[PDB]
Chain A
Amino acid sequence: YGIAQYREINAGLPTIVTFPFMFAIMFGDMGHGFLMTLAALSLVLNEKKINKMKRGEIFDMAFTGRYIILLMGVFSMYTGFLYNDIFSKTMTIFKSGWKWPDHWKKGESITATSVGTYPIGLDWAWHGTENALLFSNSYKMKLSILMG
């Protein structure tokens, strides 16, 4: 973007964390984030050999930023945990705060009742529901506003 002034607050120090984390917020997937983490780790652990060998334009890039991609992948895994989004699915790790009705006929629209709060991440009872978008969209818009 541009070269900072002499003895000016460096923009590269907060970027290290903010840039991968904003990328993770936009990305938000624990399965795709895991694939990114593995792709970056392949470069990170084998960085000596890649440094020794010649690299192309697309290979020199994404290797000088191998740690960038590693941080983006780790943060994407974290956000996907906070979204409960593993390869577009959901993880039922904890107990949901939503309780479905005791009994209902097949094909009958049912609304869950609140019992508690989900400890970490979005509730997995929000997966496949009709109003899943109405909740996730508000959550993500307010998340964007707050973290911006």
Chain B
Amino acid sequence: DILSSIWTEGLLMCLIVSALLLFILIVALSWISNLDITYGALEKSTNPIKK
């Protein structure tokens, strides 16, 4: 009465814990990638009529 020969209870627990951690990591990496630098205030205004 074992869970599996290769997909043992310990291996499945480790795999799904790592899956949860990797899901959180992937979400965080998507957040960090979606971060965009606001270039408007980091450049010199090229308008002579105004500013």
In-complex A–B contact (CB below 8 Å): no
- Residue positions of B touching A, CB distance < 8 A: none
